[PDB]
């Protein structure tokens, strides 16, 4: 805190409770006692623990039937109308797409929908896998996810 | 019908104007004018101005009659106080509260 190290008054005689600095945390407009510093909040996760968590997520997804597998999944033009009509035909609303090959066409198609997300198999993550209700696969994505989880 | 006259930030002390108000509370209007004319206080002068403001206020805006008007409710609340500095002996200073008040009268016929 901006201030001085001058004692506010003499130690004895004045009748006030003693003080030594204008910046003391008891004082108004004084410093904080245990003021926070910029810190890292990330945690170490073991690789086996992360992989086992992913296996548990996908296993319970298969168990409760929030996992839909299609052999092919693409659009001809980057039109969100075409994409939304196709998911309306499929009757799906809040969806996590994962695809084997990063297709810029359908990626730019799905960029604007906040209930529909699209990902590659190397980019999948537990919080989205749990958050999105219906999650769909391509067959190639299933193969590479299976091999990378071993 | 109730008619209300207030003097806000009245430059006087709440205790003194309460003494005068307690003198004139509950009396009939012309009598209260006699007490306020013949009571020797600046507080009495101030509340006399407020009371005639109330009487003419009721006369103009409600049309009630002066003979049956009666001061039914008088009360003073403390207004904000102006703070000053009074220098004393040996460097010390005191704070003077130049106290104000809010004077209120309610006149009615019934």
């Amino acid at each position: 805190v901006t201030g001085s190290g001058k004692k506010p008054w003499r130690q004895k005689g004045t009748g006030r409770a003693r003080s030594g600095s204008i910046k003391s945390p008891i004082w108004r407009s004084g410093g904080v006692t245990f003021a926070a510093r910029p810190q890292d909040h990330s945690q170490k996760v073991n690789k086996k623990m992360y992989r086992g968590a992913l296996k548990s997520i996908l296993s319970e997804l298969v168990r409760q039937d929030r996992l839909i597998v299609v052999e092919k999944f693409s659009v001809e033009a980057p039109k969100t109308k075409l994409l939304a009509q196709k998911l309306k035909d499929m009757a799906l609303e809040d969806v996590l797409i994962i695809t084997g090959e990063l297709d810029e066409n359908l990626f730019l198609a799905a960029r604007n929908l906040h209930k529909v997300d699209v990902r590659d198999a190397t980019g999948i993550d537990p919080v989205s896998l749990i958050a999105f209700d219906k999650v769909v696969m391509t067959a190639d994505a299933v193969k590479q996810v299976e091999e990378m989880l071993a | 019908m109730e008619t209300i006259a207030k003097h806000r930030h009245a430059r006087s002390s709440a205790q003194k104007v309460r003494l005068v108000a307690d003198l004139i509370r509950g009396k009939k209007v012309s009598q209260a004018l006699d007490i306020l004319t013949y009571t020797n206080k600046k507080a009495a002068v101030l509340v006399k101005k407020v009371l005639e403001s109330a009487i003419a206020n009721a006369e103009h805006n409600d049309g009630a009659d002066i003979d049956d008007l009666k001061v039914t409710k008088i009360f003073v609340d403390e207004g904000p106080s102006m703070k000053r500095i009074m220098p004393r002996a040996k460097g010390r200073a005191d704070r003077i509260l130049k106290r104000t008040s809010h004077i209120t009268v309610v006149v009615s016929d019934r």
Binding site: G13, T14 | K90, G91
Partner: peptide, 16 residues
């Protein structure tokens, strides 16, 4: 500052 009858000596040090 401080009061003179506290800064003083004859009456402050009354019981030495």
């Amino acid at each position: 500052t401080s009061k003179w009858f506290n800064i003083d000596n004859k009456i402050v040090d009354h019981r030495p």
